[PDB]
Structure formats: C-alpha cells, structure tokens
Write a protein that binds this ligand. Sequence first.
Ligand code: HEM
Ligand SMILES: CC1=C(/C=C/C(C)=C\C=C\C(C)=C\C(=O)O)C(C)(C)CCC1
Ligand SMILES: CC1=C(/C=C/C(C)=C\C=C\C(C)=C\C(=O)O)C(C)(C)CCC1
Ligand SMILES: CCCCCCCCCCCCCCCC(=O)O
Length: 463
Amino acid sequence: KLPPGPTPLPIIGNMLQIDVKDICKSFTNFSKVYGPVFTVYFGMNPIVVFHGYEAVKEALIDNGEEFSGRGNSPISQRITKGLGIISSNGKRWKEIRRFSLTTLRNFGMGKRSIEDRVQEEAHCLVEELRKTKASPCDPTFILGCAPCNVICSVVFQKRFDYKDQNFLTLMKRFNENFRILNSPWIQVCNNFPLLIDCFPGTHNKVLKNVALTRSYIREKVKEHQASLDVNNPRDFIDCFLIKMEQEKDNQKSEFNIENLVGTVADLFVAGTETTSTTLRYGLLLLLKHPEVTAKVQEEIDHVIGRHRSPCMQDRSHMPYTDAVVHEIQRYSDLVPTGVPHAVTTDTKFRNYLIPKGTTIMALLTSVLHDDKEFPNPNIFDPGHFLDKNGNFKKSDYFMPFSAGKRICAGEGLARMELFLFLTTILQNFNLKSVDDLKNLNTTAVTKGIVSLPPSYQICFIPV
Ligand code: HEM
Ligand SMILES: CC1=C(/C=C/C(C)=C\C=C\C(C)=C\C(=O)O)C(C)(C)CCC1
Ligand SMILES: CC1=C(/C=C/C(C)=C\C=C\C(C)=C\C(=O)O)C(C)(C)CCC1
Ligand SMILES: CCCCCCCCCCCCCCCC(=O)O
C-alpha cells in the first residue's frame, strides 16, 4: 500500500493542486497534512516524497540500496539514452561511477592533480575580475566560466582561453540547454509526453545543442586516442581509454566509447551550472554580510598570506571560512526537491509498500532548513557550522549533495572549487555594492529543479 496523499484526478493526478512554480511550497504544505512520507501523482505517475531528516535518511541511507535508482523519464530517455553516470542504472552505473570516482581523486589523472588545475583557474578568475577595473558588473558570466573550465581541464588536456570562441559556444549550448530544462515546463512535459509536440522549436534546439556538444566531445576523444600513452594519463579521457583497453577482451564491457562521451557530458552538465550557481549565490551573500567577509579575509591573511595561492590544506586551519562555505551551500539550497530517484525493486518503507520503478523524492530543503539543527534556518549564519569555541561543527543534516549511494559523484571537486574560488577571490578583492546593502535581497528565485540567486551588481575592489 502506497503512502497516503491527496486523492488525484482521473488523468492529471494532483497536478492542478501543486504549484509547478514552487513545488517545495506545495510539498511542505502536504506534509503538514500527511506527515513525513506521502504520495502525489504527476499526471498518471505516482511519486512518493520524503520530508524531514528522519524520512530522508531512512530512505536514501538506511534503505539506500532500494532508493538508488534512476527513473528514466521521456525527456531523459532521448538525451542520455541511459549512457553515462547520471542516467545509468545497475551494473553499468556501478562500474562507471566507481571508475569515475577513482579517477576524480586529486591524483587519479596522471601527474598533475585536480587541485592544481583548479588553482590555475582561480588565478585566471581573479585575473578577469581585475579587468572590470573595480566598476559595477553582473558576475554571472565570468563566474560561470571558471567552473566550466575546471571540467574542461579535468576531461581534456589543457584549459581554454576565456576568449577561445570554441570554449564560448561550448559553454552557451550547455547553458542554453540548462536554461531550457530548468523550466517548470519540463515537469509538465515529463508526465504528459504528448505536450512535448507543442514545443518543436525548443525541442529542436535541445537536440541540436546535444548533437554539437557530443560531436565535439567525440572529436577530443579522436585526438586523445592518437596520442595516448597508457603510462601517463592526462585527464578523464585518457583514464577512460586506458580502462577500455584493459577490458577489450570481454565484449560485454560497459567501458566503451558511448559511455565515455556520455560520462564526460554528465560531468559538464552536473558540474558547471551547479557550482557556478553556488559561487554566484556566495559572492552575493559575502557582499551583503561584510562582517562575515572580513572575518574570512582575516583567516586568509593569517593562514595563507597574500602572496601565495590558497590550497585545500588551508581549510583544516580555517574553520570559520569552511563554516562560511558550508552555510553558503545550506542557505542557497541549490536543489530543494533533490533529484528524483526510482526504487530498484518492490520496497517496504517502514509501514508502507512502494512498488518497483516508482519515482522517489527526498526533499533536501527540509533537512538544510531543519529548525532544530539550524536555529533560525532562514537566516544566513556561519554559526550554524561553528561550535562554542569557534571550531568547525559538522552536521548530519548537511545534504546539499544529497545522500546515500547516489550522493554527488564530484562532491570533492564541488567543495574544492568553492573553497579555492571564494578564498582566492576574497584574498585579492573586497566586495562593494553600488547601493545600501539593505536593498540587497537574498531570497532565491525558485522556478525549476535548480534554484538561482536573484540578479545583482557587484564591484570587485582590489585590496
Ligand atoms: C556546488 C555544486 C554541486 C552541487 C550542489 C551538486 C549536487 C548534486 C546533487 C543534489 C546530486 C544528485 C544526487 C542524487 O541523485 O540523489 C548530484 C549528482 C551528481 N553530481 Fe553534483 N553537485 C555539484 C557539483 C558537481 C560537480 C562539480 C560534478 C562533476 C565533476 C558533479 C557530478 C555529479 C554527478 C555525475 C552526479 C550524478 C551521480 C549519480 O547519479 O550516480 N557535481 N550532485
Ligand atoms: C545530476 C544533476 C542534474 C542533472 C540531471 C540530468 C542530466 C539527468 C537527470 C535524469 C533523471 C533524474 C532521470 C529520472 O530518474 O527520470 C541537475 C543539473 C538538475 C542538478 C545537479 C545534479
Ligand atoms: C532534462 C531533465 C531534467 C532537468 C535537468 C536540468 C536542469 C538540465 C539538464 C541539462 C542537460 C540534459 C544538458 C545536455 O546534456 O545537453 C529533470 C532532472 C528535472 C528530469 C529528467 C529530464
Ligand atoms: C516583451 C515581449 C512580449 C512578448 C511575449 C510573448 C509570449 C509568448 C511566448 C510563447 C512561447 C512559446 C515558445 C514555443 C517554442 C517552441 O516552438 O518549442
């Protein structure tokens, strides 16, 4: 028996009872009436939601093996075709995600570490902010390049010149497609496929952007295979090709070109817009909270100094800054409803039974905003991650990357980009607003699977 929930309508389920513009608002509201676990229907499809740390943990963690599946929706099926790591299941997923995790270790890609590739970008990042000559600007674009280049640097040999036209279009397609798919419309179309016909232009655009993007990713593999030296890998591509060669004999090996071009793409899409969005939400919060930013700058000066680039080792000596990066992710609440899962088999969740294949949703927001774990969860405060003596306080409720067997595969890289970008920037700059900080609103604009910070201007004044 499925978890109780609003009784649905004959064809559209509870659709005309949910705010497609702000789903969490609708879900939280259902929890006040149905409790921690409940069922809602998007059209014909049943979806069971988990609200609050207890339900979310029990699902993703305790009953982790059951809730580690990807549902495979209509839109989803014509893009990734089940290829890769974000949209794959079973044997193929376990093998691509184990390899990926292994090669995304700081030193899993040959001699140059991931950390070195990220520091180089942070430098180029501050270098671009210099070119704004301290005038007011919207950091969306420059701030969106760095995280893109990081991936480029991780899957290809060298990074791109910010002005390298080949980099720019390779960035717009991913952005363009990201904008398209982070619309409340993908929900409607995903549960009512027929509606997709009403959007030929949009549908054609996505397809084209995916063709060009994959097409370019396949070229970079051509080149890589003609210069491969199995002894010294250069990036994610080499590490994959080497693995391929080692599996060349068993013809049912998941390590084939298709999963490669697919996995690389998964890295871009899951790794660009996300950290890029968290960074942008971060500078805004530091721009609005000068008291927090000075304290951070005081740790940089003391531990890192002003001549050398910061590095991950500096975090263990900077509990305040770390707490600021942790509170930036909690507050920004990038992915409130979390990404949907599907159960691998008939599953008994405490008192109920969830049939295999059913779509599941663990509301990360409900954890990131638990008002017992983070007193006054609606206010930005590094203190939520600091104890009485100013030491870093970790929380089991810190799930901006989700939890369980499907936790973000590049969590290590997300945090490295956040730490090294924010501290490098705050070491060479101070944040000035063109107007009183009081005017500055921090309320996210939630209109899709991914929340964005409100638009804003910011002046990067060199210290
Ligand atoms: C601050 C930035 C980021 C945040 C908040 C974030 C968050 C998440 C979340 C919420 C998920 C879904 C977990 C689930 O299915 O339950 C996820 C998945 C994933 N992330 Fe990230 N992510 C970020 C950046 C990165 C980066 C930089 C990469 C790549 C190098 C990446 C790689 C992926 C991949 C491949 C998955 C799918 C994993 C799977 O289904 O097995 N992410 N991340
Ligand atoms: C990984 C990931 C993302 C992208 C998802 C992609 C490319 C496919 C999802 C397919 C699903 C969720 C299929 C299903 O189960 O029906 C977004 C950028 C939103 C946010 C951060 C984590
Ligand atoms: C499409 C899609 C979704 C949204 C993902 C987002 C926000 C961006 C995707 C970008 C891609 C798929 C880019 C590319 O590969 O070019 C969700 C998870 C709600 C459900 C399954 C279908
Ligand atoms: C200031 C400009 C006002 C004009 C507002 C026009 C609003 C209509 C928008 C229609 C969008 C439909 C897009 C369909 C795209 C497709 O073919 O898939």
